Design an enzyme around this catalytic site. Structure first.
Site, PDB file in Angstrom:
ATOM      1  N   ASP A 181     -28.373  28.180  13.763  1.00  0.00           N
ATOM      2  CA  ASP A 181     -28.422  27.191  12.671  1.00  0.00           C
ATOM      3  C   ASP A 181     -27.373  26.097  12.839  1.00  0.00           C
ATOM      4  OD1 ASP A 181     -26.309  28.781  11.917  1.00  0.00           O
ATOM      5  OD2 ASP A 181     -26.818  28.676   9.749  1.00  0.00           O
ATOM      6  N   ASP A 224     -22.331  28.408  16.540  1.00  0.00           N
ATOM      7  CA  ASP A 224     -23.640  28.557  17.149  1.00  0.00           C
ATOM      8  C   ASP A 224     -23.667  27.951  18.529  1.00  0.00           C
ATOM      9  OD1 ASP A 224     -25.668  29.448  14.676  1.00  0.00           O
ATOM     10  OD2 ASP A 224     -24.032  28.122  14.007  1.00  0.00           O
ATOM     11  N   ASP A 284     -26.886  26.268   8.140  1.00  0.00           N
ATOM     12  CA  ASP A 284     -25.530  25.661   8.203  1.00  0.00           C
ATOM     13  C   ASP A 284     -25.458  24.386   9.049  1.00  0.00           C
ATOM     14  OD1 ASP A 284     -22.865  25.528   7.441  1.00  0.00           O
ATOM     15  OD2 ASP A 284     -22.222  27.156   8.816  1.00  0.00           O
ATOM     16  N   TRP A 323     -20.254  21.691   4.617  1.00  0.00           N
ATOM     17  CA  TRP A 323     -20.158  22.461   5.852  1.00  0.00           C
ATOM     18  C   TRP A 323     -21.238  22.103   6.863  1.00  0.00           C
ATOM     19  CZ3 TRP A 323     -19.551  28.291   4.270  1.00  0.00           C
ATOM     20  CH2 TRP A 323     -18.473  28.413   3.382  1.00  0.00           C
ATOM     21  N   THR A 355     -27.850  33.801  15.278  1.00  0.00           N
ATOM     22  CA  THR A 355     -26.562  33.308  14.783  1.00  0.00           C
ATOM     23  C   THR A 355     -26.694  32.492  13.489  1.00  0.00           C
ATOM     24  OG1 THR A 355     -26.596  31.385  16.242  1.00  0.00           O
ATOM     25  CG2 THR A 355     -25.562  33.389  17.091  1.00  0.00           C
ATOM     26  N   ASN A 377     -24.866  34.326   6.221  1.00  0.00           N
ATOM     27  CA  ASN A 377     -26.165  34.398   6.909  1.00  0.00           C
ATOM     28  C   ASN A 377     -27.185  35.273   6.174  1.00  0.00           C
ATOM     29  OD1 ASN A 377     -25.378  32.570   8.829  1.00  0.00           O
ATOM     30  ND2 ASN A 377     -25.166  34.035  10.513  1.00  0.00           N
ATOM     31  N   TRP A 418     -16.718  34.728  15.190  1.00  0.00           N
ATOM     32  CA  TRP A 418     -18.007  34.743  14.513  1.00  0.00           C
ATOM     33  C   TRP A 418     -19.193  34.760  15.483  1.00  0.00           C
ATOM     34  CZ3 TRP A 418     -15.084  30.827  11.158  1.00  0.00           C
ATOM     35  CH2 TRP A 418     -14.450  31.480  10.096  1.00  0.00           C
ATOM     36  N   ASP A 419     -20.073  33.759  15.415  1.00  0.00           N
ATOM     37  CA  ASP A 419     -21.326  33.756  16.163  1.00  0.00           C
ATOM     38  C   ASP A 419     -21.131  33.939  17.675  1.00  0.00           C
ATOM     39  OD1 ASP A 419     -21.360  32.323  13.682  1.00  0.00           O
ATOM     40  OD2 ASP A 419     -23.016  31.009  14.342  1.00  0.00           O
TER      41      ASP A 419
END
Ligand SMILES: [Ca+2]
Ligand SMILES: [Ca+2]
Lengths: 316, 316
Positions: free
Chosen positions: B10, B15, B40, B83, B137, B186, B249-250
């Site tokens: 996203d 990502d 996002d 964001w 992700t 998510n 994170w992702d």
């Protein structure tokens, strides 16, 4: 021969585009020092980014090293905390972490940490051989301090003061529950300082207020042009600073120092609002037939600005 | 030989770090397509950044071009608008505007604009020779759509689904006046989709929930390390993405695909909250002795992650 210049800034993205325009053009500008104020940045970050840009140019194009001082000026009205992180982010960028620049700045930092920003501005101007052009891209607190402390011993040595601030015939940009929107941030951060400088009879001031700056948009179409010059560190720097409506703002002050024919200059008598009301920081036209305070920039050339930024960012 | 992979993302900074890890490692990963969801990011920007990264790698390391599809999935609960601008900013960066990449993406965009993201994910998985590893992700909306539409005709072709989402034994990150803070974004974006996928008996799921991701901080000290590798485009990309507390994170999902020994895997039965109450989107442990839903990642190796990111970003 080069103009002798000091950059008195507050460490946001546009401040550094201004610095880059000045430092990348040694044929036109001898940058003898920089001052950083804890306004639209956290001063330690603004200080470190200034240092690394200085070191990168010294390495690549042999511009001299110069003193850098953190001002101890304190806000009358602080910037929003969220906006103040720009220098922190820049300090982590790969173009500001080239190993040679990081190494040199580690060596230079202790001597520069010792300087007081306000006193450095005074000392550099007063000890200079030629009159000094001061480029002010943060609040006017340091200039005010110098005028207050030294008066004509300081002002007699200033060639001109080119300032990003105010909003004369257009709205401001300070939008808070306690404000009316008529004021611009650099003025609003310390209105008494702005009043002391803008209305000082012994300083030649050129004001880039929102009137002029908001006719020079920084648009995605423009910013994308740095990709074709990605081989140049300064293009990586400026392209990223601009990629992070948006206007040229502080960069126009440096552009005017490089090419004063970039703008029309209109004399205007201003009356800076230092009240604590909704209009605090406003820079309206003065009533009556009073002596003008400043030359206000009008209709700056978008084309000359573009050409100057793109040429400067191919220097290295 | 390479694993066949699809990245279902996203379009935020993390990502794209995930995408870069996958695409930069053709010996381990054959990236056969990407899906971009309007979660996002603003999908047009996420789509364009995906395209340009694809084009840059094709140019520099001869990775094949692949289809890219915009999902038409719509939010149950949208991301904060502020964001969502990350891809817009990235699309203006100099490293994403190299003239050859811009030119190639202009040529490829019309064919890719035509794809429907959900149908592309289904078609790529179902038509693939080998089973496909799907790296998720963004939200689970596209995976859910495929399971709903095709059932075992789709699930029988998935090797494993590696997912960034949820929070099992730790707090969430969805802090709104209407929420309790127990949910992760998510999942919260589309809880019914997450429930459909995570609890599906015919898909092997590995979940990178906040439990694991929040043990892998992205710190300034780490990010500054890209400066020493500024000569590499991918280091300019990732260093900038990370310079713009913050965790991997992702990027950990792609890292696990590259090196599954990066993490411990613990079986956990989950019960996804699809209510409209304060706990909407929570992924708590299921009560009772039910069949586990997923392997939850635990204590991922910070060192292996670092080594993998820094090596990958020296590829070009
Ligand atoms: Ca400034
Ligand atoms: Ca994401």
């Amino acid at each position: 021969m080069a103009k002798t210049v000091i950059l008195d800034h507050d460490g946001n993205k546009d401040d550094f585009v201004a610095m880059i325009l000045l430092l990348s053009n040694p044929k036109k500008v001898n940058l003898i020092g920089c001052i950083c104020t804890d306004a639209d940045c956290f001063v330690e970050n603004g200080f470190d980014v200034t240092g690394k840009i200085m070191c990168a140019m010294h390495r690549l194009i042999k511009t001299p090293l110069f003193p850098i001082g953190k001002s101890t000026a304190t806000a009358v009205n602080a910037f929003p905390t969220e906006w103040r992180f720009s220098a922190k982010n820049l300090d982590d960028m790969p173009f500001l972490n080239i190993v040679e620049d990081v190494a040199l700045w580690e060596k230079l930092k202790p001597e520069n940490e010792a300087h007081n920003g306000q006193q450095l501005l005074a000392d550099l101007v007063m000890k200079s051989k030629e009159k000094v052009t001061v480029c002010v891209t943060g609040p006017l607190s340091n200039m005010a301090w110098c005028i207050e402390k030294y008066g004509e011993a300081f002002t007699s040595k200033v060639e001109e003061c080119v300032i990003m601030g105010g909003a004369v015939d257009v709205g401001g940009n300070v939008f808070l529950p306690t404000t009316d929107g008529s004021a611009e941030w650099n003025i609003y951060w310390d209105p008494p300082a702005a009043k002391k400088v803008l209305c000082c009879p012994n300083i030649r001031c050129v004001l880039f207020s929102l009137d002029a700056t908001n006719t020079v948009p920084v648009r995605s179409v423009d910013v994308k042009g740095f990709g074709a010059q990605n081989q140049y560190l300064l293009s990586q720097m400026v392209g990223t600073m601009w990629a992070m409506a948006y206007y040229a703002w502080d960069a126009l002050t440096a552009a005017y120092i490089l090419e004063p024919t970039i703008a029309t200059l209109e004399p205007v008598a201003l009356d800076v609002d230092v009240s604590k009301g909704k209009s605090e920081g406003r820079t309206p036209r003065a009533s009556g037939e009073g002596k003008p305070c400043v030359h206000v920039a009008r209709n700056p050339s978008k084309q000359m600005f573009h050409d100057l930024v793109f040429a400067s960012t191919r220097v290295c």
